[PDB]
Amino acid sequence: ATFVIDCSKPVEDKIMEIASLEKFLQERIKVGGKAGALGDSVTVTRDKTKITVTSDTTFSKRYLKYLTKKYLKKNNVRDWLRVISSNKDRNVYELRYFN
């Protein structure tokens, strides 16, 4: 299971730090009921505008959405951005403004 978080728009808007989100996901993602135990089973990789999460075992997109929402609340940008599933790709999320 591979999932991608798209933050290209906020990155271009200079309101998001891809490295910060990658660190948050690495520290908070739970493997076998324990947080931060990514190791070989779960791998989180970042890019210029996209974050990719891969796990050998089955993974839930909803958990990634919940972690991203927690990060947004922590960084005090939840009131401006929301996590929305992309129309075409079924394994990717996007951060977008709502107004």
Interaction between residue 7 and RNA (CB under 7 A): no
Q: Output the CA–CA distances (angstroms, integers) from residue 10 to 38, 54, 59, in the order listed.
A: 27, 23, 26
Task: Tell me whether residue 95 is exposed, middle or buried, using C-beta atoms within 10 angstroms of its C-beta: 0 to 12, 13 to 18, 19 or more.
Answer: buried
Of 9, 23, 50, 82, the residue at the interface with RNA (CB under 7 A) is 82
Q: How far is the CB of 61 from RNA (least distance, A)?
A: 3
Q: Exactly one of 35, 37, 41, 45 binds RNA (CB under 7 A); which one?
A: 35
Taking CB under 7 A as the rule, does residue 70 contact RNA? yes
Structure tokens at 94: 């996007």
Residues in contact with RNA by the rule CB under 7 A: 30, 32-33, 35, 58-63, 65-66, 69-70, 72-74, 78, 82-85, 87-88, 90, 93, 96, 98
